[PDB]
């Protein structure tokens, strides 16, 4: 994983510096970001409500 991150020219540690979209100020202690494969289950609120 470290090698693959390096090949893309990204920090090997997997954490990036991020800016708060509302205020614009930086967050201390960089955070883990990245893409995850998510699913939407069959429990839809309009059926439940």
The single residue listed with the structure tokens 């609120």 is 45
Q: Say whether residue 24 binds other proteins (CB under 8 A).
A: yes
What is the radius of gyration, based on Cα positions, of the chain? 17
- C-alpha 27/C-alpha 47 separation (Å) is 40
Q: Say whether residue 7 binds other proteins (CB under 8 A).
A: no
Q: Say whether residue 33 binds other proteins (CB under 8 A).
A: yes
Q: Say whether residue 37 binds other proteins (CB under 8 A).
A: yes
Residues forming the site for other proteins (CB under 8 A): 18, 22-25, 27, 31-40, 42-43, 45-46, 48-49
């Amino acid at each position: 994983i470290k090698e693959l991150l390096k090949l893309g020219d990204l920090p090997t540690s997997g954490q990036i510096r991020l800016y708060d979209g509302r205020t614009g100020e930086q967050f201390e202690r960089p955070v883990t970001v990245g893409y995850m494969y998510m699913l939407k289950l069959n429990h839809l609120v309009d059926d439940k409500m």
